Amino acid sequence: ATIGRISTGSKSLDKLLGGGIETQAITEVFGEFGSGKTQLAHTLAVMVQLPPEEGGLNGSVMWIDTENTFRPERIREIAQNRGLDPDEVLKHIAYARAFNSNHQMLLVQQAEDMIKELLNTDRPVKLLIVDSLTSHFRSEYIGRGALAERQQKLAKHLADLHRLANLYDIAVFVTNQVATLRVYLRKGKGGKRIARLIDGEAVFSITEKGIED
Ligand SMILES: Cc1ccc2[nH]ccc2c1
Ligand SMILES: Cc1ccc2[nH]ccc2c1
Numbered sequence: 001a002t003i004g005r006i007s008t009g010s011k012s013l014d015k016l017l018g019g020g021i022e023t024q025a026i027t028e029v030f031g032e033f034g035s036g037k038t039q040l041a042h043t044l045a046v047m048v049q050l051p052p053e054e055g056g057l058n059g060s061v062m063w064i065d066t067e068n069t070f071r072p073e074r075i076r077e078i079a080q081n082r083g084l085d086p087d088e089v090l091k092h093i094a095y096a097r098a099f100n101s102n103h104q105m106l107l108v109q110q111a112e113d114m115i116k117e118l119l120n121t122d123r124p125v126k127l128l129i130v131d132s133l134t135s136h137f138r139s140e141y142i143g144r145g146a147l148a149e150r151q152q153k154l155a156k157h158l159a160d161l162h163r164l165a166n167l168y169d170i171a172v173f174v175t176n177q178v179a180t181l182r183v184y185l186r187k188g189k190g191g192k193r194i195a196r197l198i199d200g201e202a203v204f205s206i207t208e209k210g211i212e213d
Pocket of ligand 1: 096097098099100
């Protein structure tokens with residue numbers, strides 16, 4: 001099945017990514033606190049809902065939040081400035097807070113039910129966000145013997161995500177505070193954000209349109 005490509009809102013970043021973030025893939029953004037990872041997530045949750053000729057996939061969204069950082073009003077704001085209706089856009093984001101890492105893993109299995117339901121409708125799920133992929137795993141797996149167990153659980157979680165991405169043609173987008181594709185993000189001068197691929201650089205600003213050049 002052809003890979004779909006979701007515009008980030010930044011032409012610079014889109015170019016770096018080869019046209020946008022890919023379906024049938026997990027794109028992992030890395031960066032320090034305040035780098036803009038969650039702003040990119042909010043922007044993508046809007047962009048994906050655009051028609052293909054405007055950089056989207058006419059898609060629905062599922063969002064797993066581990067840090068209570070999802071902001072419906074930010075979504076409304078971005079939607080308004082991208083030519084979309086803020087209420088309709090929010091309606092197409094299925095939102096869940098993950099209580100701990102085990103519940104986070106279960107929510108991915110739960111997501112498949114809605115994915116199946118919407119699959120052959122005109123608004124299939126096309127983006128699954130996990131923000132943050134690792135925050136619960138970091139806080140819970142501490143002490144002698146914990147590392148091997150943390151890593152096994154995280155591997156299983158990533159495998160579950162890859163399966164949804166590949167089986168249902170979805171872009172999975174995850175954040176990691178300091179992957180088929182790893183992107184390092186950092187805040188620079190004048191509040192500009194700079195992105196680099198791991199294993200040129202794109203530059204963008206955070207604005208009322210989400211992100212743009
Ligand atoms: C952190 C947190 C708190 C309350 C919740 N209810 C459902 C999920 C969830 C997660
Ligand atoms: C409503 C809903 C149900 C299951 C889910 N899994 C991930 C997000 C999510 C949202």
